[PDB]
Amino acid sequence: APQIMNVSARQTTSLDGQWKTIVDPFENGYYDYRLKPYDGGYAQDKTYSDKTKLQEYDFETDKLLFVPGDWNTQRPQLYYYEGTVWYRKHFEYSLQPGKRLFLNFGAVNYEAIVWLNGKRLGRHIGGFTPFNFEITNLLKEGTNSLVVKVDNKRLPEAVPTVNADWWNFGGITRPVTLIEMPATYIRDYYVQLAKDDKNMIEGWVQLEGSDKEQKITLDIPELKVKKEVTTDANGYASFLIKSKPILWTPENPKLYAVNLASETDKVSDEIGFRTIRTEGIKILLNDKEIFCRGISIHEETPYYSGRAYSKDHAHTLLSWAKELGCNFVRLAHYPHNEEMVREAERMGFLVWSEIPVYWTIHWENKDTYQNAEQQLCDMIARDKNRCNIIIWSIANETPHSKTRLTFLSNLANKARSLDSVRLIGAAMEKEEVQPGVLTVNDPLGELLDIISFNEYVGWYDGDSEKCDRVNWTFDTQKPVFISELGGGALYGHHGSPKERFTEEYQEDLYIRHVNMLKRIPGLAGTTPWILKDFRSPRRHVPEIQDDFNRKGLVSDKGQKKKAFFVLQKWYKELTEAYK
Amino acid sequence: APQIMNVSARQTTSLDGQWKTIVDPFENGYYDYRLKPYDGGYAQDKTYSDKTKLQEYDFETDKLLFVPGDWNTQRPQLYYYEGTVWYRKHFEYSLQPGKRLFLNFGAVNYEAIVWLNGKRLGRHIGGFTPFNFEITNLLKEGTNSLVVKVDNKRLPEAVPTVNADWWNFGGITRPVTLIEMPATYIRDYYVQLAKDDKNMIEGWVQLEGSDKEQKITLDIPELKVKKEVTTDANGYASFLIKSKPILWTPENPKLYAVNLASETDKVSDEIGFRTIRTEGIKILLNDKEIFCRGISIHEETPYYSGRAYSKDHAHTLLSWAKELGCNFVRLAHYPHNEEMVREAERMGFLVWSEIPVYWTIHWENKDTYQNAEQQLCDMIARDKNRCNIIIWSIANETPHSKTRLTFLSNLANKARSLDSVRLIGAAMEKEEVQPGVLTVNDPLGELLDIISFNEYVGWYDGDSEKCDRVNWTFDTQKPVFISELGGGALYGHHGSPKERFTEEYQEDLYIRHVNMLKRIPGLAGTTPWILKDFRSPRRHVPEIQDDFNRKGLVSDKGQKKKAFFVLQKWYKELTEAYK
Amino acid sequence: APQIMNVSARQTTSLDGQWKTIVDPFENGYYDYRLKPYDGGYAQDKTYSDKTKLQEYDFETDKLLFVPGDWNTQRPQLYYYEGTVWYRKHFEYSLQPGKRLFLNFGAVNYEAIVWLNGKRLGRHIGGFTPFNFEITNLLKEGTNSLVVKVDNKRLPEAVPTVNADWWNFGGITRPVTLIEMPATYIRDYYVQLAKDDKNMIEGWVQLEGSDKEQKITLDIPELKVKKEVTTDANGYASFLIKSKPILWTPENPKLYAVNLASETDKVSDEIGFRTIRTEGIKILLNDKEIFCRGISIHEETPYYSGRAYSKDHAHTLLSWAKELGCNFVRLAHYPHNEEMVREAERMGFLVWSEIPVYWTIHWENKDTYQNAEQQLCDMIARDKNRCNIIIWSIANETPHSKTRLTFLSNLANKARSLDSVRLIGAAMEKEEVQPGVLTVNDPLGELLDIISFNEYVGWYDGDSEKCDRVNWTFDTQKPVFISELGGGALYGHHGSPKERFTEEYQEDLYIRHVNMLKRIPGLAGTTPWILKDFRSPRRHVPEIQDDFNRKGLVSDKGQKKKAFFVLQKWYKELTEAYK
Ligand SMILES: O=C(O)[C@H]1O[C@H](O)[C@H](O)[C@@H](O)[C@@H]1O
Ligand SMILES: O=C(O)[C@H]1O[C@H](O)[C@H](O)[C@@H](O)[C@@H]1O
Ligand SMILES: O=C(O)[C@H]1O[C@H](O)[C@H](O)[C@@H](O)[C@@H]1O
Ligand SMILES: [Cl-]
Ligand SMILES: [Cl-]
Ligand SMILES: [Cl-]
């Protein structure tokens, strides 16, 4: 039922591959012609063997889809598809009596209803966060039937809502995993430095099962730490360990082998330690002023531009950002798969991690808030031990209103209640308060630790020359973070630096925009939009966009555009200046 | 803006062919990222010639679609597509000063918004009824730009609603026509027999313009009819002509040339005359008891199964119905294109004409009712002079409730207020009030002239044996009309007569069902479901259905299944019996 | 083995529908990796039930194709496909002992190899002619397996060769039929007027079976003919019957019910009678000088532009030619399906019937000649009783050489040896012997009864003005027949009459070309190219051609272009002038 920390380190079995599927736009498999649920629906996964009876479906002889994956890139007919697709898997598993078995979904966009052997396990909303079901006592001998009804229709009340600038990728987009656990298991745990304290590790551990009062030992061998505690009746224990670990940095992304062992379970992890705070306009990593030499990244694969999910995908994207000279990636606009965050952690990239509270969210809808806050809780719960994450982002480009401010205030408060260490950001927007004078006067800023905002001077707001004349001012002394900037270009399409969508315009733009950045007071980070061209249904210039947002510094085919090297050169200079 | 009678006989020019198009799932061409309408959207049809400015679209270099047509069968990517597609046409027209010009859409499913030269002409809802705009004063010299935003998203409040058993065919599905008119023109007229009177032609004529009081002459030369009247101050005149026309029958579908001439306009038509009434359980055409030897038909083309629109399409479908032995076709579940109705009239098929008040309509929604009634008015308005139509149908398979009954009673009253002659029906459903006793108890029946209903004994309700043993009773003495019956089969798929979806099962079903029909007291008509296999997203048996309803007596490739000849045999016997 | 006359009138059973298929571009199902045939190939149709053994295919779970049909329009992946596709059908048939069973293929393009129950029946080359196999003693109880290996790769030595201006439509393109016969049956027969003799019917009859010496009776009841003869030991009889039938004309396409009955078989037919000859520059139908008001037609369906095969397809196309005012159709460039020829015969269209000896045929290859002459024999054998055919065409636009002349001479001689009545044509080409002077000086002309040739003055040869100035002369006094002329236009695409591919240019072209035709000495027929836009892989103008030859007077969507009415008007004038 609840989230499981560090799924990859458990006894895991993959259900991935190719599953039988039924595309069901009118939801015939769920509703009868009176629009009422009915028992003989597709959840029952009845193979149509006896043709003397009538039924209107058969998984057994239908078409396959790859799992994990978006469905959109797998069939021309599903490119634009918004609606229901049924997924069906048969599997066997031999579970020794007394052991427990969980079914974990890395992500399904957007609504998933799950059945096992004809019985509903439950439902999930939110297309970028994991969820589990315990199947211990539902598992049968021999063949088991797993049915997933996946629907990605856009809903006004959803998070995100009916408008966004990326593709509506439906399906079982991340791996499906069977996790076996002992009868009482270590479900969740936290191990990080105390706030602003290079010399104190703090943490807690949470057991689940009938035997919740046990002795726990936290072992960090390289630190000669061997801390032993006893959980309470609720299965919980906290600890404080005087220690002086080598601190994680993008240059030296030191991780420690951490082993937790209770009487009935054991799990190993790789966890780094670092302090993060602001001081005036400075961001201080481990007490050292740093610049966030960043780049933004959508969860989309090189070359074929589907939903990313594997370590291969992550390593390819992050190696491009490595070459670009980054020490920071903004993972937009939703939690990415865990492989991406772990590979950023191993390679040395600080991370901004975000939930899709994006554009015109229904600020007055209480179910909508519940959804937003659950995604926030799940985002932090999964990755709270990833030291490379330093910013949680609660929103992106949301319009100003009283109800919106209340909504986002409650998320910021919840985030701080869950995590006292990391910084709280959100992509705000700029305003030209007087001709030639740009600022950010969003009341949300008072709730953030940084003045983080998107700006497109020279692309949406003027031609590139405007970068050469505008000036910036800010009314609070917090570090300034430009979470998006840039412009579009098609790789291989050349012309005058005045002609939009050529490589030469995007190059000229970045030269003048970089020079403008150098004069923005308090600037401490930049994550230009974006590393790689990505799919968007709002980009309709034929032979230029072709359903791609072209603001990548790398094409969707991994080709470095001229502008790539402008930013690379600046990042090489900032690397030396901040040594 | 108002409807125009007999468009095909006016001075017309076609705008059909291939138009430039933009698929726009998130409606970027209409709403900005704050979800607000914006100027600079795609309705302005700005060719992206000047690449020093930023634009996100270009009709001029985008892809084509055929007009008329559904979009679904034109590209694999559009097979399931529900959403917006923009259509764009450039055209020139030389309009003499003083003449008027109208833009007529035969049909656009579902919502159409139309601009000419960047100016919004208006908006239409309902995918099967025509609509017009006057463009007299908006036409420019040189190139004119016509832009249509077409959206087929399913809406709960729409007519039809979010569930139906046929394909959601979006696009400009029927021809687009420019109509030139004199400054004052004959917009509408009615010429038919008075109710139950073979010896009296009644009618009226309605002018539109500034010179509305004129002498009008009604000319039927074959009948030596020359009737002069003068319109009143509203452009309106009625008439009553004693005459004894040769009456239209299926066997002799006699049509007269009718010529209307006012002082400022002239239009010619082909119109037949017939009486129609019920008497007890009898249906009397021209005072002769008849049986409606019928077949149902969707508006879908032979072979490639797109939206039908041409006289070619109509002639092919109706020639199959001719071979089947029919004197009657039920055109379901919405107004068909006028070519279909005209070819039925010329070839000799009585017609049932229906609006898509189908399944779970939102009976409580006043906008839903106004939409339903507007489609009802438009259906009758276009075809009120087609004497082969004898039944208007206001509903199909709608759940019983008090509010549903008031909704449909208001439609029935409106239909009778518009047409005192034709019968009013609706597809009701049957009940098994006790084992082996079937009936129709629907209180809607009190408002209809016939006990019209769908029944699927032998397919959805029991195996074919059940036709052998059930009995039927009715609580009132109106003619009984079975508007649907039958079962599915794939042509070329053979096996035991017990095996569903084989030709042998469908054949055995029809043999036993026909014998059951012979004992239904008061049966006066049948329109089995259905002439031709058609597209439906609720039909998922792979290699058997493949997104087609397989209940056709003819395959979608024009092949007569075995059960075709069972109904043909019965119809030949009925033809002799009713001689 | 041999051809069967009048297949439709026999005891027939259709195997059409949807068959299992395997696309096999490298012919893995026929050749092993040493490029040698092997026994376990796909002809064996072994369902892959036992997965403890290895095989590389399974028809049972593979994809379907419609039969009859081209494969190209059925799947995007098969649009351009040239190569092998395997087709598989299971069927049962109960054959009473002593009866015979034949398997008839209307057409398969290009090479077909056929197996029944794992045994090779044989092979066929030629994509437009029928072929049969006797399966009497190969049929098994229960399920029978029919496998067809279809390959449409272009071969240099083939007929047609590697270049042609129409789509390479592969597959089982016409119906597949089981024909049951008595032990001795009437296989072939001929019944027509004697050459140039309105008062003498001549014919013959040919039996097949162990009982070949029988009494035969030819019955034409409406003529009060009841001719009885006795076949010889080879099963053959000839006859001459003094009679004066009403003669077939396009205006009154009179057909007689003809019944042939032997001791052991009987078959009915509908056969018309007419004389056809040339006299100087006149073509004389039934001794009356006629003009061939013609239009050319490819075997391609309205709307979706696949391979045509049904009576519906034929009626739609011929109704367009009816409206155009034609009394003649050129069926190019190969024998069309029998339905097309029979519907032309019923509706009143004279026919030119052709074999695909087209462009750069391998004149020196003796196998190539054998192929050409077999197609000629099969073309004449099927349709020798269709009085509406008056011209057999042996070639189209073939380059001049000694070997080509020998090749075509032998075909012309063979045609005359098979049919002494009909005219022999071939599409030759024009030459500009001096500026402004056009002629046809092809030595092939001496072997033809008409000076039949293609010309494209105003499209390929000059702009439309050239029609206004060139002059024509011919050195023999035979009737002149222009078998192709015209130009391309996209329906709905308008502009100046000077702009090619607009409707206005094609209209202006036809106005000036029609005027030129009126001054061509000896002109007796025209079949402009072409009735309907058709698929060609040599037409690459985007948004204009899009893989369609646009020389239709009707679009592929059945829309009459402006030029349609220019030719219609001329044909209406010729109808009056030749009364
Ligand atoms: O217009 C763009 O390119 C971008 O605008 C916004 O900044 C948004 O946050 C991005 O998601 C989007 O891609
Ligand atoms: O189930 C079916 O086939 C049919 O059921 C209903 O009777 C309905 O009116 C049809 O539109 C539908 O196709
Ligand atoms: O160029 C064309 O349009 C045509 O040229 C030749 O006349 C040929 O016979 C046609 O098959 C072809 O379509
Ligand atoms: Cl872009
Ligand atoms: Cl069905
Ligand atoms: Cl062309």
Side-chain angles (χ1 to χ4, degrees), chain B residues 285-408:
Chain B
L285 177 72
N286 303 332
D287 290 338
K288 183 174 175 57
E289 167 184 13
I290 59 155
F291 195 99
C292 294
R293 321 185 305 268
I295 193 72
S296 292
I297 312 174
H298 260 291
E299 186 177 27
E300 191 186 270
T301 63
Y303 299 102
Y304 69 105
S305 304
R307 269 286 173 245
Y309 58 89
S310 76
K311 190 204 316 296
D312 292 329
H313 300 147
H315 188 71
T316 298
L317 296 164
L318 294 167
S319 87
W320 299 349
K322 189 185 180 64
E323 192 179 342
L324 185 47
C326 300
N327 68 354
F328 190 111
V329 294
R330 172 189 186 212
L331 306 182
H333 280 293
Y334 39 74
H336 287 211
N337 61 82
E338 193 171 7
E339 299 288 350
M340 180 67 151
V341 183
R342 297 262 196 172
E343 187 72 345
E345 178 197 49
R346 178 189 77 82
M347 291 180 75
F349 302 88
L350 299 154
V351 163
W352 157 319
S353 177
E354 183 164 293
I355 56 180
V357 178
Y358 177 102
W359 290 3
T360 46
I361 297 293
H362 284 205
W363 316 108
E364 82 291 338
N365 181 316
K366 308 192 172 58
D367 296 318
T368 303
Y369 178 79
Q370 291 304 325
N371 184 8
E373 196 185 83
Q374 183 65 245
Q375 306 195 28
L376 172 73
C377 288
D378 289 337
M379 176 182 65
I380 294 170
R382 189 193 78 192
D383 290 354
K384 55 175 174 286
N385 294 320
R386 306 280 77 84
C387 67
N388 57 319
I389 298 171
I390 54 160
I391 293 163
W392 305 117
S393 171
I394 61 170
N396 179 90
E397 291 201 342
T398 57
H400 302 189
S401 72
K402 170 179 165 185
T403 302
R404 166 263 191 179
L405 183 56
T406 303
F407 195 115
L408 303 182

Side-chain angles (χ1 to χ4, degrees), chain A residues 219-235:
Chain A
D219 219 86
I220 310 176
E222 185 173 1
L223 290 182
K224 291 178 298 185
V225 164
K226 193 185 242 295
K227 182 68 173 316
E228 134 96 11
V229 307
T230 300
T231 47
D232 62 25
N234 295 315

Side-chain angles (χ1 to χ4, degrees), chain C residues 196 274-278 283-286 390 421-423:
Chain C
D196 289 323
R274 60 89 189 95
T275 61
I276 184 64
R277 69 174 194 275
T278 65
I283 304 174
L284 306 183
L285 179 67
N286 301 331
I390 51 159
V421 170
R422 296 180 169 91
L423 310 181

